[PDB]
Amino acid sequence: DQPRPAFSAIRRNPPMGGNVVIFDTVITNQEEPYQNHSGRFVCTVPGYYYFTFQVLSQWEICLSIVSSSRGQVRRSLGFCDTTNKGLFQVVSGGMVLQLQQGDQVWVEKDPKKGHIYQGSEADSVFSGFLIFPSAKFQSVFTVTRQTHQPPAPNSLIRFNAVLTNPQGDYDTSTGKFTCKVPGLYYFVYHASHTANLCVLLYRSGVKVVTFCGHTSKTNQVNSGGVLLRLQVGEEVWLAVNDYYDMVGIQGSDSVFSGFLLFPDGSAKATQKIAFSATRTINVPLRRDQTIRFDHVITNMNNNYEPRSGKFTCKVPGLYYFTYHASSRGNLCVNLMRGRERAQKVVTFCDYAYNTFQVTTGGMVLKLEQGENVFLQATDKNSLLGMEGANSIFSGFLLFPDM
Ligand SMILES: CC(=O)N[C@@H]1[C@@H](O)[C@H](O)[C@@H](CO)O[C@H]1O
Ligand SMILES: [Ca+2]
């Protein structure tokens, strides 16, 4: 069969000490590459993988996805939240890594900024999955912005440094991705800032989504992302508006990744399953209400129902689900999986006092045919959905037939 390595793990009863962040409770671990006793993913199948975390702090936290090869540690970008006010904050980050057999990948905390919430109210997650195995028409990039000076107001955000870009599809001299291989792409970013920042994602000259985060002095991470089916020559890029700050503190970086999931014309079209939907309704949510994302950007194979907000599995398999929510107050959402009655997988909470925020969560889930996945509101219901402060829910099948 084709290789299907993919995992998600959360914290519940983590072992104590060291700077490796151990996610002790496994949600998904197909081919068991993840070691919950150590917090380390081990590569068996060489290739390009995507790794991401969404970790809850109440104080100061700085985290970095670290890898090793032949036992030698390879340090990398960091992501921090230093709000430091006692309220829940989600720090997030992610990147593509090209790995060889035996390489390991993990999340490390800064020993001086290492606060991670411990308790039952909300969750922290680490996930990863193979994008394509090594050894052929692919597209993948992770780029970063290696400068201390922020973008100009109302301009395209250039990411000048490359972590991986084997097809040259992101051009660091123009700041744009240009499609060579037509098909369905995932695009995602995590940008560090210490003043207000809105990031806009553009496709062929049209603004697709915008996410904003406000801060004064302390460091936070603005995240966003979307699935788009692109044709040859189409351009995608990120931009800022009047809120342009990308000045991270030491140890907090900015990354933009993208990768082709489903090439057009590569067969088993019914298996190309991907949706991205935004919420344009701002009626107050009540506790236990399914959160409807009414506006469809992408819905390949029509497994997402915008009238309900639920995804329903037709092709059993491994899926990655993700969301980014704008908000002006305290927000907790339950990620639900089940049939008639669904059960909570995790709760993500992210608090905000007298400000604007963008939070995110994601999870790899194995689904059987007929199971539903959706987001469910709680008593902490400050969720905002509008042009210039979007809320989006997305999901995609990881391993369609070759
Ligand atoms: C399903 C499974 O294997 N769960 C184990 C659990 O029994 C053990 O307590 C924990 C140690 O932190 O590691 C988890 O992987
Ligand atoms: Ca927050």
Author numbering: 2 to 136, 142 to 408
Sentences from the paper on this structure:
The C1q molecule is a complex defense collagen, being assembled from six heterotrimeric subunits, each consisting of three homologous, yet distinct polypeptide chains (A–C) encoded by the C1QA, C1QB, and C1QC genes oriented in the A–C–B order on human chromosome 1p. C1q also features the most versatile recognition properties, being able to identify not only bacterial and viral pathogens, either directly or through other immune proteins such as antibodies and pentraxins, but also many altered self elements, including β-amyloid fibrils, the pathological form of the prion protein, modified low-density lipoproteins, and apoptotic cells. We report here, the production of a single-chain recombinant form of human C1q globular region (C1q-scGR). The three monomers have been linked in tandem to generate a single continuous polypeptide, based on a strategy previously used to generate a single-chain form of the homotrimeric globular domain of adiponectin, a protein structurally related to C1q.
Although sialidase treatment of serum-derived C1q-GR had been required to obtain crystals of this protein suitable for structure determination, the presence of sialic acids in C1q-scGR was not an obstacle to the determination of its crystal structure. Its X-ray structure, refined at 1.35 Å resolution, allowed us to check that the linkers did not introduce any distortion. The recombinant and serum-derived C1q globular domains are indeed almost identical, as shown by their very small 0.1 Å RMS deviation on the 331 Cα common positions. The main-chain trace of the segment encompassing the C–B linker and the first two residues of gC1qB (GSAKA) were modeled into the electron density. This more rigid C–B linker only slightly alters the main-chain position of the two preceding and following residues, but the positions of their side-chains are conserved. The A–C linker is more flexible, and only the first two residues of gC1qC were modeled into the electron density. The single N-glysosylation site at Asn 124 of C1qA is thus glycosylated in recombinant C1q-scGR. With a RMS deviation of 0.08 Å on the 340 Cα common positions, the two refined structures are almost identical except for the nature of the bound ion, which is either magnesium or calcium. The presence of a single calcium (or magnesium) ion at the top of the heterotrimeric assembly has been proposed to contribute to the stability of the recognition domain of C1q. The fact that the 3D structure of C1q-scGR is virtually identical to that of the three-chain C1q-derived fragment shows that this strategy can be extended to other proteins containing trimeric gC1q domains.
